[PDB]
Amino acid sequence: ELQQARTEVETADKWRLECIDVCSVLTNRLEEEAGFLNSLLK
Amino acid sequence: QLRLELQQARTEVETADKWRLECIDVCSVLTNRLEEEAGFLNSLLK
Amino acid sequence: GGSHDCAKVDLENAELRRKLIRTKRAFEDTYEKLRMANKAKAQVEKDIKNQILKTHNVLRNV
Amino acid sequence: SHDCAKVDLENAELRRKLIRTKRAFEDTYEKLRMANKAKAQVEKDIKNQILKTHNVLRNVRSNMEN
Ligand SMILES: [Zn+2]
């Protein structure tokens, strides 16, 4: 009855870490795009 | 083996889902901002 | 000065008048296009400032 | 009957104003050409950013829907 929950941590942390990856891609994208828009003013 | 068993569900079915729901919320607002900003750039092109 | 072909200089003066009008109107049209370009550029810069403020808000407040 | 001297002076003045106006038009047209070039470059970079964002979003859809 130990691995029945020790498997849910790998799946829950799988979806969580994948979400963190997507959040990293989106955050980096908004940073680069906002930097580009900032370059049109300089 | 009660401590080691219930210790698992304390975080992997709670905290790991807490930061996951906060995470998907962040991805939602960031996705919306990227969509409206891309739409703004397309509006500049047209 | 010397003599000239009177009718030819009259017709040439009329041609120069029409060419002057046309060239002047081309200048006015080009200047107007430049004015519209400057205005559109300024407005676009304003909108870009708004979008930079928006992304700044959604980035430094999350 | 047109007064030859006056008509010659008018010819000279018309050529002068014509050349002057042609040059003002040429300078304004050059400024507009530079503005259109800079705008073309800006629109090109904007197209680059739209390509990047579209690829990111489509990759998120291919990472979540499938
Ligand atoms: Zn004459």
Side-chain angles (χ1 to χ4, degrees), chain C residues 4 6, chain D residues 2 4:
Chain C
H4 65 179
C6 302
Chain D
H2 64 167
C4 305

Side-chain angles (χ1 to χ4, degrees), chain C residues 30 33-34 37, chain D residues 25-41:
Chain C
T30 303
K33 277 184 170 60
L34 178 58
Chain D
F25 164 75
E26 285 177 351
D27 302 342
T28 304
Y29 187 90
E30 169 65 15
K31 298 179 185 300
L32 178 61
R33 188 186 63 82
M34 300 270 79
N36 295 335
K37 183 176 184 179
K39 182 182 179 181
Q41 184 66 38

Side-chain angles (χ1 to χ4, degrees), chain A residues 5 9 19 26 33 37, chain B residues 5 12 19 23 30-31 37:
Chain A
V9 60
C19 180
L26 299 178
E33 184 153 293
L37 296 181
Chain B
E5 182 63 27
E12 70 211 23
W19 291 4
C23 176
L30 294 181
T31 300
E37 199 170 43

Side-chain angles (χ1 to χ4, degrees), chain C residues 4-7 9-10, chain D residues 1-5 7-8:
Chain C
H4 65 179
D5 194 339
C6 302
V9 185
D10 291 331
Chain D
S1 301
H2 64 167
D3 198 318
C4 305
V7 176
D8 292 329

Side-chain angles (χ1 to χ4, degrees), chain B residues 12-13 15-23:
Chain B
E12 70 211 23
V13 209
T15 302
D17 298 328
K18 164 187 173 60
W19 291 4
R20 173 180 170 269
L21 291 180
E22 177 182 356
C23 176

Side-chain angles (χ1 to χ4, degrees), chain C:
Chain C
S3 63
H4 65 179
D5 194 339
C6 302
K8 179 182 177 301
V9 185
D10 291 331
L11 268 60
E12 182 173 344
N13 280 12
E15 291 177 7
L16 288 170
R17 284 183 172 90
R18 290 186 294 270
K19 290 184 180 182
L20 178 58
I21 294 298
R22 181 182 62 93
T23 298
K24 195 171 185 309
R25 293 173 170 172
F27 165 72
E28 297 176 358
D29 296 2
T30 303
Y31 190 87
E32 177 62 24
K33 277 184 170 60
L34 178 58
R35 167 193 168 273
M36 292 291 301
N38 299 335
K39 184 174 180 299
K41 182 180 176 182
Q43 179 61 35
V44 163
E45 289 179 355
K46 175 181 178 300
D47 301 337
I48 293 174
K49 290 182 180 180
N50 296 13
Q51 299 293 336
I52 292 176
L53 178 60
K54 207 169 186 178
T55 302
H56 170 275
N57 292 330
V58 310
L59 277 185
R60 297 188 187 177
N61 300 324
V62 294

